Amino acid sequence: MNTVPFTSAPIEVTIGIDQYSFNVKENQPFHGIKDIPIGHVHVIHFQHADNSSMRYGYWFDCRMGNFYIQYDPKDGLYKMMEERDGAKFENIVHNFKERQMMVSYPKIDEDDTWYNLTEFVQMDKIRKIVRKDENQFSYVDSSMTTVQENELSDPAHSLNYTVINFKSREAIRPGHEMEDFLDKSYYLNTVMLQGIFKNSSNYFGELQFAFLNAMFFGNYGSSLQWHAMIELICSSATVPKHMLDKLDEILYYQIKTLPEQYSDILLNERVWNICLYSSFQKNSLHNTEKIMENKYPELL
Amino acid sequence: GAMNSSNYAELFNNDIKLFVDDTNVYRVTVHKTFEGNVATKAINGCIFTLNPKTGHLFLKIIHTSVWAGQKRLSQLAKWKTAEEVSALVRSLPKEEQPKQIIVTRKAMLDPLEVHMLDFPNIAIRPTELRLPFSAAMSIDKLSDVVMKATEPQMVLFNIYDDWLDRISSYTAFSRLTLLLRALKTNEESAKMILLSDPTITIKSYHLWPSFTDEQWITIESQMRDLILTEYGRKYNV
């Protein structure tokens, strides 16, 4: 198990680690998070008590290096940093663990929730969506726009999600206008899966990452990308059976994890009604249809 | 966005535009079968593509053969309309291509937008105007060319005959919409108004009779009366 030490907590903040969250008081003797499960990406995220503006956070993988958080009083945020000195890092962690100044990543042994939400998410793919090649971890926030939002503005600070546009020359072959518009199979299978993603794992990785940035940061463009990637599969007549089975599992754990009280801002009525009740795949999402009908029947 | 009464003068400015109406593309008669089921039989249709400034009508005749062995014909009809308008634009020289295409029905927007992706500077717009272009098939010479077609055909008309020699395109469009509204509301009565006087004929190269300016005033008044009479009849008012 791996550790993200904190130098200090000089401002009052709600700290997230994956699906968990903890309130830290201003100048509380908080020095970080231990027992973080190896084998998964994680996200450590922040919302200031005195300014709920900018949810922001860091995607990281403890296998890729030793990472700590230090508050920057100039830029006014908790920053992730890499510690390149192995023995210094081990010595800082040891002192803080001994003085019991760290919260334990609170994983229930029965609980596959985080694995189920990040099954296809890999740090190398995150680092291609979030471009800052000098760090092994990725910064995301509330207000970061997508490459697609910026086409319709600082490109450095953008989420480079794969552009999906149903009314684009990419989505519609000349001579197959009606066919390709009504049946997105071409767009999904040749352009997106064979062409850009190479495989369904990379496509599901980006979908899962989009969802988590929508949920953990309230990032609007991320929410648009998550819905677009769902609608692209559901609006295709021809999808490999393994992909539909895996999509149902993916969506089920997303809908299961979503805070009930954020359903009105995180879920697009049109897309879900269309995917569950009108689309080619309206009968292929049994688990997702059942949780949606039982937890959010007001949306449908 | 959408074209209404606020921006009505826009139809008669120097930006080339076309109205597209798909109402008469897919046309059927409904009939009982020997077993007492119901069956449709398609008849020849047409796309009504009009320049409101010039009167130039691009009448694309949709022959019943294009439906043979096809499914969901009401859906296909929208996409076949979009395909044919796209083909018309590509056939026109650049300086004749429209800057705007206004569809009379919102269901044409996505089909036409998808067929015209290669023309991102041609705006595809709906209209809040209720335009009586469905009554095009009440114009004897248009109905005649559609029903006689044995194959897909494009026929070119000026729907204003020679009116623009005497009146503006605003007034010519106003006259056309009133005539088509009258033909749509009470076809028999409208045609009676247009042909009642045998001394006024339709030139071989025209669609409408050769009314003097004073006679067009009388005809227009009789058309308004017909529409008002039929409104009274409908609503018992």
Curated annotation (Swiss-Prot), chain A:
Substitution effect: residue 236 to D/E: Disrupts interaction with PRP8
Chain positions with Phosphoserine modification: 236
Xref: Gene3D superfamilies: 2.60.34.20, Aar2, C-terminal domain-like (1.25.40.550)
Region (Leucine-zipper): 244-265
Disulfide topology: none
GO biological process, one term: spliceosomal snRNP assembly
Phenotype upon changing residue 236 to A: No effect on interaction with PRP8
Protein modification: Phosphorylated on serine and tyrosine residues.
Pfam family for this entry, one: AAR2
Keyword 4Fe-4S included in the entry's annotation: no
Compartments it resides in: Cytoplasm; Nucleus
Additional remarks: Present with 7330 molecules/cell in log phase SD medium.
Subunit-structure text: Heterodimer. Interacts with PRP8 (via RNase H homology domain and MPN domain), competing with BRR2 for the same binding site. Component of a U5 snRNP complex that contains at least the U5 snRNA, PRP8, SNU114, AAR2, SMB1, SMD1, SMD2, SMD3, SME1, SMX2 and SMX3, but is not a component of the U4/U6-U5 tri-snRNP complex.
The family this protein is said to belong to: Belongs to the AAR2 family.
Known role: Component of the U5 snRNP complex that is required for spliceosome assembly and for pre-mRNA splicing. Involved in splicing pre-mRNA of the A1 cistron and other genes that are important for cell growth.
UniProt-recorded name of the protein: A1 cistron-splicing factor AAR2
Source organism: Saccharomyces cerevisiae (strain ATCC 204508 / S288c)
Lineage, top ranks: Eukaryota, Fungi, Dikarya, Ascomycota, Saccharomycotina
Gene that encodes it: AAR2
From Swiss-Prot, chain B:
Cysteine pairs bridged by disulfides in the record: none
Compartments where found: Nucleus
Region RNase H homology domain, residue ranges: 7-237
Coiled coil: none
Additional comment: Present with 468 molecules/cell in log phase SD medium.
Role summary: Functions as a scaffold that mediates the ordered assembly of spliceosomal proteins and snRNAs. Required for association of BRR2 with the spliceosomal U5 snRNP, and the subsequent assembly of the U4/U6-U5 tri-snRNP complex. Functions as a scaffold that positions spliceosomal U2, U5 and U6 snRNAs at splice sites on pre-mRNA substrates, so that splicing can occur. Interacts with both the 5' and the 3' splice site, as well as the branch region. Has a role in branch site-3' splice site selection. Associates with the branch site-3' splice 3'-exon region. Also has a role in cell cycle.
Record note on domains: The MPN (JAB/Mov34) domain has structural similarity with deubiquitinating enzymes, but lacks the residues that would bind the catalytic metal ion. Contains a region with structural similarity to reverse transcriptase, presenting the classical thumb, fingers and palm architecture, but lacks enzyme activity, since the essential metal-binding residues are not conserved.
Quaternary structure annotation from Swiss-Prot or TrEMBL: Component of the U4/U6-U5 tri-snRNP complex composed of the U4, U6 and U5 snRNAs and at least PRP3, PRP4, PRP6, PRP8, PRP18, PRP31, PRP38, SNU13, SNU23, SNU66, SNU114, SPP381, SMB1, SMD1, SMD2, SMD3, SMX2, SMX3, LSM2, LSM3, LSM4, LSM5, LSM6, LSM7, LSM8, BRR2 and DIB1.
Protein name: Pre-mRNA-splicing factor 8
Organism listed in the record: Saccharomyces cerevisiae (strain ATCC 204508 / S288c)
